Design a protein around this ligand. Structure first.
Ligand SMILES: *[B]([O])([O])[C]([C][C]([C])[C])[N]C(=O)[C]([C]C1=[C][C]=[C][C]=[C]1)[N]C(=O)C1=[C]N=[C][C]=N1
Ligand SMILES: *[B]([O])([O])[C]([C][C]([C])[C])[N]C(=O)[C]([C]C1=[C][C]=[C][C]=[C]1)[N]C(=O)C1=[C]N=[C][C]=N1
Ligand SMILES: [Cl-]
Ligand SMILES: [Cl-]
Ligand SMILES: [Mg+2]
Ligand SMILES: [Mg+2]
Ligand SMILES: [Mg+2]
Ligand SMILES: [Mg+2]
Lengths: 204, 243, 231, 241, 250, 226, 196, 244
């Protein structure tokens, strides 16, 4: 009944020293029934990364929408969109459906190509921007993720250390949520290289 | 040239020839007048008897708007009816929102703006009538005359149609000889005379006289037609003056 | 000349040529006569045929139990206007339980025709109408012109050669007005009136069309052998 | 030659319908003048009642647009009243939407934009009027802003409009060359009206009775027109010195 | 009523010419001279305040207009057309960009939107083209400083320096000799004043000349403090006094 | 949420806490509730966060266009009128509860706005879940003819009362001062009385602690030449 | 809310408390419920604050536009504009408004417009939640053609009692006097009216 | 009424021609020449800017060559403002297709859509047609490298080598002479520039008077790269081919 918890899933993002990390689980289900273990929730438009939790049809629809808009942006602007600008575009796009909203929890992550500054942001389903310094959480295990992040996180972590922190935050949060898990992906993002890692986790 | 072929086009003079051509239709029409009196107004019109087959006192020309405004016009009769229909809508919406009956100056502008709007586009034709109208409101008696251009002013006496010059001359005498004012019953008598005197311009066919009036004392500020004995009294007075 | 291309254009002398051209279509139409007394009102119409194989075009249309008209000019325009009258008569009955006054019916036709003479794109109606009726103020006869001008009359005629019938009625004015409580004699006067507009052709059984309305007489149309009595 | 019938460009880059609308402006044969005082803005205009049958009280080309804004028109009365009604509606709407009284210059711009649209859109004709707006603005003080059929508008130290505008304009120009200030240095509005009438008399070379003039005065928080008796008092003061 | 002009008033003639656009350009030719020069660290735009009357207060009429905090515009041709275009240009900068991306548009894209509006008046029903040519100077983070011309057709071109209106042919020749890629903003202002003096007949001073720049950020003109990333508008209109100071070193 | 507005001698000050919540969870610890409508017109927002942001941006955008159209600095009553009519039209469904303040050519002003579109005038105002705690402080310590220094102190104290006593409010105090004839100063994190203590332990993991299945480079660059 | 308007010899006086409540919390203790729609046409507002403000703002706009075209409107005209808004939007509005004004021709007039959007011209009118507690008092103590001082005392005593018994009413007693002389604002504080 | 001033932009002549389309083509014949040449391993787009100035900022300028998506580009001949209206519509159409089918739009489908829009203005609406002719250069996995052209009539055709704008008669004769089917991109680049150099109304062909672009599979492995040439890069290729 509750659109935000039919399919399940989670996304978490973290900042480090000259780097950002964004991670998600791979589950898509129909309430109790597990359907797919390959449903990735993180997408990217140029160097800007977008994770989306919530209703899976809206996750797909919004990805297609932001691909659409970022492609037109690039043709007209003659440059890739930046995380700060994309964050505003997500907010604008969500608020135009104020009284008929997409049932999603988006999370933006990336590094500004000009300033080199790490950037993360979270949103509610109607467009409100949460621009945190430390971390952003989203999905059916958001309580769990808040608890993990708030204890495990420390500032200025190196890329390879940040990977361990965000991975443990996701895994242990997912294992306390029935509608999350079934695999996980972690993106480590630096100014001009991005590494993608699939995590080994319990499959129940 | 070609400036006169389309409405709302300025000629090199700065003139709208289509409106000036509408005036020619007004000048071709029968004579109609208005007289402002002490506590009201009087309207009168010339009705040409084209044939014996016309039923007397049936083809009424003067029209009422709301219950306190009288309207008469010269030129294209249907255009005048269209304008009065609009006037009635304007008066109804005013009374609907503001409760009080529409003041005469307020009513005058409603017609004025509507007629003026028909000089703004080539997709419409100007009105082929000059309308004399007025009545009694909270501030007293008012008489107006409205032209095809949308131009209107307040008047002490007004006249239009084929016998307007003759009528205007007669109205000017009344203004000079009665600075303190004219009574309602006097104005009806004078109105009858002026129409009869103005009939010399349409002397081929005989005519029928039609008079109406609004007066604070005589009609309680409501528009009424002059009928029966009071009408005959005015006709007798008029017939006596021409002889 | 240069000012007759559309209805939205006055001429330099203040004339509307498209309206005048519409008026011309009536003069080409077949003659029809209207007259009334105090009790009854009568329409008489000379129907026109295309040829000997063709039927005679109907001229008279019923609008209500107490009202109807005869046409001269473009017949389809008479159908549009008569349909409008039917609706207006019908609105008066359904909403106010009130038979529509003949004078008010004329006012409604005037205003409908007027809108077509002041707006761009449209055209004036190309037909003249003679409306008869019996309402709360007795018998009535109206003449409609597509300029918008509607006139209440004792008697009249419109169409080709209508001047002859109109003169006759102007002489007979004092006689036929007094024909009260006698429908047949009032029709006789109407048939004799329309006869003054005839040349070459005469009134035959399928040529003549008569209608009547009165005090205790609903609007009824007579055609065929029903009018042989009056020939 | 249909480029002279509607508002499209001629080969010279001109809009003839706009130019002919400017010529309609002088059809009334009336001259108007506007000047600024310290605390006030005064506008005067010739009043001509040729017909004896006219009610002279109703013959006017000055309009009370809002409590603060007044407007005098040069041009035919139908177009004048069209512009007046619109300005009143715009001024009222502005107050409702934005919570404060519409400034004189802002109304002038709005009406000028509407006029511009008629010069660009074919189905709408220009209005054959010049609109002179006057007020004492709460920010800018005494204000005179004038609009024309081209959609042009600008603020003024003083201005004149009509058939004999140039004679009045030069007369005013020469005064401000002497005083070297942007206004009439005078405390009371009564004396500013006297200045306005005096300089119109000198420029036109005609004397005025009480019924030959029409006067509008803008002060802080209200605009008002003078009666025939108020003008008479003004004419007496001029004659006595 | 109804707008029954649903057809184009600008059409191709047998020779392939769009008459109304050509005639609009002729109206621009009659217009007062305006110019723009681009420097390394700024842009300057300038024009003559041709006062219609000495009684008229020429300060109230603004020929040079702020569109965004970092973009300005000047014109040659019909003033009223320019005024409404500025209103539409300011609005479209918000509706089609700022309300979407949370930031002001880059110069080229705002120019593109203005160009679109002018193109539509060349093709849409019942309208004539705008009788103006615009010069739009602006700055943005990724493109730096830029200067654009926009014509009645809707066509726009980027310029290092240019002039439009009355004496544009002579003014463009004058700019070709003086312009180089190492000009500082003050040097461009100096050249702008020299170029503009040639086309002006009468008085030449701060009160008869209108001049604005796109240059350094002006935190003093921002109106508030407390946000480091907001450093103020790059658009600044030069005062009457500031112009006269540079006319002494002329 | 605790937001307040306090008038003083030569202007007006507004303040706000920085906590955003979704149910019993804190969504953002350092949320920015002071919004700029125009350079010298600022407003604090309570209720639905997206709504307070959106309605402020929209009116702020139209206020800017209005300022350019009229060649005048914007007025607080204009922002007030545009906000109330927008909110009234949406019949309270746009959940924005605002304290609108500013200085303009008319003077200094302070208003409140509720979601259904009703406005109120006052020398001191408070909105949000912590408004009762804040209003208790304002009603106890407010006086006429406050100085700039006293008004900031009173405003921040009112927010603190919300921070400590209302569970819907917390973290930091944001302030904006708008004085007549001066630039408005936005004091982001004016007070910071809720810094988290040092943790007992570092939870930095040894590298290789997490089990990995696959690795790959992600192509973020465009299609390449040659 | 406790509001009233009372006609008297020299004109009319409007009166109101200053309390706005959200349930039992007093959201505003110094509210001004006496609002101006024209120079000498004012109204007392009760019910929804948002609704009555929106209505009053629209009426002020209508009367400002009326004045520009037709000159000063009558109090009856102002009441009719209120009625039109209240009647036609009755399903969506909660507004109890008393309209009071001073003409020179008609002198002091009072029109009350309850929830349904009906209009009632009365010598005096009372409305709002607190009015219930003073129907007895006001009916017994009202006289026609009172003096200014008597009318002020009548309103002060009436609203004092309404405030005393109604939880939704309180604060200061505001009053607006409408006469030929002009417009006068009066205020009365708790210490004054409670001891009555 | 308004009928008086209607030019009637969508009617036939007695000969069965569309007046406005024909006159729009006459306009385009005065525009700067644009050439497209399709090779086995890529496509070339070359175009001449019209009588430029030394004070024109070239490196930020774009009047001829526009990008529709990553796979498709166009060369413009005619009114630039008209072209940009259509270009933005085409960009949107490509994105609509990508959103719907999750695949890049086939070149012909994009071309047909734009060509249909142009057709509409010749048959209904009473508006003037777009005074624009396009050369479409694009790639998809069905037909590979493709060249198309469209004109104000809304008619489109496929080409191996084609020119639009000024001196197309002379240009097409030269292309028809030297073009061969087994030709490569580097050779096509040379042919395009040589053809412009002979047909140009200017005294000499220089880097500042040109816009140039290629669509190559010359991208790292199975994919397509669009290269819009910079002023310095156009200057280098002019020296390489031996024109300057
Ligand atoms: B405060 O409590 O009024 C605060 C002020 C806001 C402008 C930052 N509001 C909130 O924190 C609201 C509470 C709320 C929850 C649910 C529905 C409506 C209101 N929170 C949010 O708007 C919110 C919650 N989670 C994410 C983003 N925004
Ligand atoms: B009064 O109590 O009717 C009062 C009059 C209002 C115009 C200021 N109304 C209110 O206080 C209403 C609630 C109410 C109470 C009693 C009867 C009817 C209605 N309050 C509000 O409208 C309100 C409260 N808080 C914020 C915004 N609006
Ligand atoms: Cl506008
Ligand atoms: Cl209230
Ligand atoms: Mg699990
Ligand atoms: Mg399981
Ligand atoms: Mg026009
Ligand atoms: Mg109480």
């Amino acid at each position: 009944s509750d659109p935000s918890s039919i399919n399940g899933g989670i996304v978490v993002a973290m900042t480090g020293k000259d780097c950002v990390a964004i991670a998600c689980d791979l589950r898509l289900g129909s309430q109790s029934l597990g359907v797919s273990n390959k449903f990735e929730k993180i997408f990217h438009y140029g160097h800007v990364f977008l994770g989306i939790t919530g209703l899976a049809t809206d996750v797909t629809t919004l990805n297609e929408m932001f691909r659409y808009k970022t492609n037109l942006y690039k043709l007209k602007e003659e440059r890739a969109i930046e995380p700060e600008t994309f964050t505003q575009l997500v907010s604008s796009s969500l608020y135009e459906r104020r009284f008929g909203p997409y049932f999603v929890g988006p999370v933006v992550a990336g590094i500004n190509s000009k300033s080199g500054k790490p950037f993360i942001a979270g949103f509610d389903l109607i467009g409100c921007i949460d621009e945190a310094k430390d971390f952003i959480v989203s999905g059916t295990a958001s309580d769990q993720l808040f608890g993990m992040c708030e204890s495990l996180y420390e500032p200025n972590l190196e890329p390879e250390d940040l990977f361990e922190t965000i991975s443990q935050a996701l895994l242990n949060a997912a294992d306390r949520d029935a509608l999350s898990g079934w695999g996980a992906v972690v993106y480590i993002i630096k100014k001009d290289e991005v590494v993608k890692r699939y995590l080994k986790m319990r499959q129940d | 040239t070609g400036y006169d072929l389309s409405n709302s086009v300025f000629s090199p003079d700065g003139r709208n020839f289509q409106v000036e051509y509408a005036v020619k239709a007004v000048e071709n029409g029968t004579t109609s007048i208005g007289i402002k009196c002490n506590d009201g107004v009087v309207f009168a019109v010339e009705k040409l008897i084209t044939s014996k087959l016309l039923v007397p006192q049936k083809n009424v020309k003067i029209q009422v708007v709301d219950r306190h405004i009288g309207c008469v016009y010269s030129g294209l009769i249907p255009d005048g009816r269209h304008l009065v229909n609009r006037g009635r809508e304007e008066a109804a919406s005013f009374k609907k929102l503001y409760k009080t009956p529409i003041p005469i100056p307020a009513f005058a502008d409603r017609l004025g703006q509507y007629v003026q709007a028909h000089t703004l586009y080539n997709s419409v034709r100007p009105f082929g009538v000059s309308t004399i109208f007025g009545g009694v409101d909270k501030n007293g008696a008012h008489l107006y005359m409205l032209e095809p251009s949308g131009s209107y002013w307040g008047y002490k006496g007004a006249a239009t149609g084929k016998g307007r010059q003759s009528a205007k001359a007669e109205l000017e005498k009344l203004v000079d000889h009665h600075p303190e004012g004219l009574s309602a019953r006097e104005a009806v008598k004078q109105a009858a005379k002026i129409i009869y005197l103005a009939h010399e311009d349409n002397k081929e066919k005989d005519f029928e006289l039609e008079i109406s009036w609004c007066s604070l004392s005589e009609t309680n500020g409501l528009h009424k037609f002059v009928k029966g004995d009071l009408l005959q009294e005015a006709i007798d007075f008029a017939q006596k003056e021409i002889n | 000349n240069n000012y007759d291309g559309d209805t939205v254009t006055f001429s330099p002398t203040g004339r509307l040529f498209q309206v005048e051209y519409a008026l011309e279509a009536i003069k080409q139409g077949s003659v029809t006569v209207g007259l009334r007394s105090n009790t009854h009102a009568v329409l008489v119409a000379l129907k026109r045929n295309a040829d000997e194989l063709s039927s005679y075009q109907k001229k008279i249309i019923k609008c209500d139990e107490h009202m109807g008209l005869s046409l001269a000019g473009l017949a389809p325009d008479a159908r549009v206007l008569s349909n409008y009258l039917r609706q207006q008569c019908n609105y008066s009955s359904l909403v106010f339980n009130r038979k529509l006054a003949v004078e008010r019916a004329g006012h409604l036709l005037c205003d409908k025709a007027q809108k077509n003479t002041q707006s761009y794109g449209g055209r004036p109606y190309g037909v003249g109408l003679l409306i008869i009726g019996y309402d709360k103020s007795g018998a009535h006869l109206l003449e409609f012109q597509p300029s918008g001008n509607v006139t209440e009359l004792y008697g009249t005629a419109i169409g080709a050669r209508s001047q002859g019938a109109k003169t006759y009625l102007e002489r007979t004015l004092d006689t036929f007005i007094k024909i009260d409580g006698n429908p047949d004699e009032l029709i006789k006067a109407g048939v004799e009136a329309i006869s003054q507009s005839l040349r070459d052709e005469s009134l035959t059984v399928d040529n003549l069309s008569i209608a009547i309305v009165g005090k205790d007489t609903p609007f009824t149309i007579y055609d065929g052998e029903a009018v042989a009595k009056y020939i | 030659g249909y480029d002279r019938h509607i508002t499209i460009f001629s080969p010279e880059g001109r809009l003839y319908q706009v130019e002919y609308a400017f010529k309609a402006t002088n059809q009334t044969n009336i001259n108007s003048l506007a000047v600024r005082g310290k605390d006030c803005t005064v506008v005067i205009s010739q009043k001509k009642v040729p017909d004896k049958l006219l009610d002279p009280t109703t013959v006017s080309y000055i309009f009370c647009i809002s409590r603060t804004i007044g407007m005098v028109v040069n041009g035919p009365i139908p177009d004048a009243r069209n512009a007046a009604l619109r300005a009143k509606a715009e001024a009222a709407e502005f107050r409702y939407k934005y919570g404060y009284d519409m400034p004189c210059d802002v109304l002038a711009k709005r009406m000028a934009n509407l006029s511009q649209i008629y010069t660009q859109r074919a189905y709408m004709r220009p209005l054959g009027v010049i609109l002179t707006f006057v007020s004492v603005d709460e920010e800018l003080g005494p204000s005179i802003y004038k609009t024309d059929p081209a959609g042009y508008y600008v603020g003024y130290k003083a201005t004149a409009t009509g058939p004999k505008q140039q004679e009045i304009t030069t007369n005013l120009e020469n005064h401000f060359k002497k005083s070297k200030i942007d206004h009439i240095n005078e405390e009371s509005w009564e004396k500013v009206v006297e200045f306005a009438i005096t300089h119109m008399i000198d420029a036109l070379g005609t004397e005025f009775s009480k019924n030959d003039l029409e006067v509008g005065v803008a002060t802080k928080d209200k605009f008002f027109t003078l009666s025939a008796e108020n003008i008479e008092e003004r004419l007496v003061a001029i004659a006595e010195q | 009523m109804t707008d029954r002009y649903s057809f184009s008033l600008t059409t191709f003639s047998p020779s392939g010419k769009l008459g109304q656009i050509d005639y609009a350009l002729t109206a621009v030719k009659q217009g007062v001279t305006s110019l723009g020069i681009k420097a390394t660290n700024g842009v300057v735009i300038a024009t003559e305040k041709k006062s219609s009357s000495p009684l008229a207060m020429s300060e109230t009429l603004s020929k040079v207009s702020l569109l965004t905090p970092d973009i300005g515009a000047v014109y040659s041709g019909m003033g009223p057309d320019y005024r409404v275009l500025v209103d539409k240009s300011r609005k479209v900068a918000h509706t089609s960009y700022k309300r979407i991306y949370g930031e002001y548009p880059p110069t080229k894209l705002l120019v593109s939107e203005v160009a679109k509006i002018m193109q539509e008046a060349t093709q849409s029903g019942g309208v004539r083209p705008f009788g103006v040519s615009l010069l739009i100077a602006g700055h943005d983070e990724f493109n730096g400083f830029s200067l654009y011309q926009v014509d009645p057709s809707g066509s726009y071109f980027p310029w290092k320096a240019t002039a439009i209106g009355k004496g544009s042919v002579a003014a463009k020749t004058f700019l070709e000799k003086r312009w180089n890629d190492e000009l500082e903003l003050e040097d461009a202002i100096h050249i702008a004043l020299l170029t503009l003096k040639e086309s002006v007949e009468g008085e030449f001073n701060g009160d008869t000349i209108e001049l604005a720049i796109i240059g350094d950020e002006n935190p003093d003109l921002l109106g508030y403090t407390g946000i480091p990333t907001d450093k103020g508008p790059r658009f600044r209109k030069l005062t009457s006094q500031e112009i006269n100071d540079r006319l002494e070193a002329l | 949420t605790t937001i307040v507005g306090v008038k003083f001698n030569n202007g007006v000050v507004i303040a706000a806490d920085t906590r955003s919540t979704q149910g019993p969870i804190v969504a953002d610890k350092n949320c920015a509730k002071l919004h700029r409508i125009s350079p010298k017109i600022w407003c604090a927002g309570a209720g639905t966060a997206a709504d307070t942001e959106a309605v402020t941006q929209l009116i702020g955008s139209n206020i800017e266009l209005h300022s350019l159209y009229t060649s005048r600095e914007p007025r607080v009553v204009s922002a007030l009128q545009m906000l109330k009519q927008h909110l009234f039209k949406y019949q309270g469904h746009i959940g924005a509860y605002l304290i609108v303040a500013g200085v303009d050519p008319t003077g200094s002003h302070l208003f409140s706005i509720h979601a259904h579109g009703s406005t109120d005038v006052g020398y001191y105002l408070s909105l949000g879940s912590g408004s009762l705690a804040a209003m208790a402080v304002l009603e106890s310590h407010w006086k006429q003819d406050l100085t700039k220094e006293e008004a900031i102190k009173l405003a921040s104290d009112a927010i603190q009362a919300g921070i400590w006593n209302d569970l819907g409010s917390g973290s930091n105090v944001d302030v904006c001062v708008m004085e007549i004839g001066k630039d408005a100063e936005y004091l982001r994190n004016y007070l910071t009385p809720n810094v988290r203590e040092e943790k007992q332990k570092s939870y930095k993991f040894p590298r290789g602690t997490t089990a990995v299945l696959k690795e790959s480079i992600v192509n973020i660059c465009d299609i390449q030449e040659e | 809310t406790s509001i009233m308007a009372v006609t008297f010899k020299d004109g009319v006086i409007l009166g109101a408390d200053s309390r706005t409540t959200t349930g039992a919390y007093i959201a505003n203790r110094v509210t001004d419920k006496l609002t101006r729609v024209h120079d000498k046409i004012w109204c007392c507002r009760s019910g929804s604050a948002a609704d009555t403000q929106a209505i009053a703002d629209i009426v002020q706009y209508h009367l400002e536009l009326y004045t520009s075209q037709y000159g000063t409107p009558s109090t009856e005209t102002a009441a009719s504009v209120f009625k039109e808004l209240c009647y036609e939007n009755k399903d969506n509005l909660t507004a109890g408004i008393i309209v009071a004004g001073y003409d020179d021709k008609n002198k002091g007039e009072v029109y009350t417009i309850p929830l349904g959007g009906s209009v009632h011209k009365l010598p005096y009118a009372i409305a709002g939640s607190g009015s219930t507690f003073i129907y007895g008092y006001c009916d017994k103590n009202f006289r026609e053609n009172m003096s200014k001082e008597e009318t002020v005392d009548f309103i002060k005593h009436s609203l004092s009692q309404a405030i005393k018994w109604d939880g939704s009413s309180g604060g200061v007693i505001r009053m607006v006097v409408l006469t030929a002389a002009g417009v006068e604002r009066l205020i009365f504080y708790p210490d004054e009216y409670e001891q009555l | 009424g308004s009928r008086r001033y209607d030019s009637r932009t969508t009617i036939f002549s007695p000969e069965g021609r569309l007046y406005q389309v024909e006159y729009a083509l006459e306009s385009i014949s005065h525009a700067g020449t644009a050439i497209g040449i399709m090779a086995s391993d890529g496509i070339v787009l070359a175009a001449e800017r019209k009588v430029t100035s030394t004070l024109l900022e070239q490196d930020t300028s774009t009047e001829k060559l526009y990008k529709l998506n990553d796979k498709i580009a166009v060369a413009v001949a005619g009114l630039t403002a008209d072209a940009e209206i259509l270009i933005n519509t085409a960009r949107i159409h490509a994105q609509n297709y990508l959103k719907t089918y999750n695949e890049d739009i086939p070149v012909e489908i994009l071309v047909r859509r734009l060509s249909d829009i142009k057709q509409g203005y010749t048959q209904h609406g009473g508006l003037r047609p777009f005074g624009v002719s396009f050369i479409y250069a694009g790639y998809d996995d069905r037909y590979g490298y493709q060249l198309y052209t469209s004109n104000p009539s809304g008619n489109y055709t496929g080409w191996k080598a084609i020119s639009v704008g000024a001196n197309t008669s002379a240009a097409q004769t030269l292309l028809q002479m030297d073009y061969k089917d087994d030709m490569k991109v580097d050779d096509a680049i040379e042919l395009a520039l040589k053809t412009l150099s002979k047909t140009t109304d200017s005294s000499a062909l220089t880097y500042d008077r040109l816009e140039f672009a290629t669509i190559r599979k010359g991208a790292n492995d199975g994919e397509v790269y669009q290269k819009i040439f910079k002023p310095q890069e156009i200057k280098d290729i002019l020296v390489k081919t031996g024109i300057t």
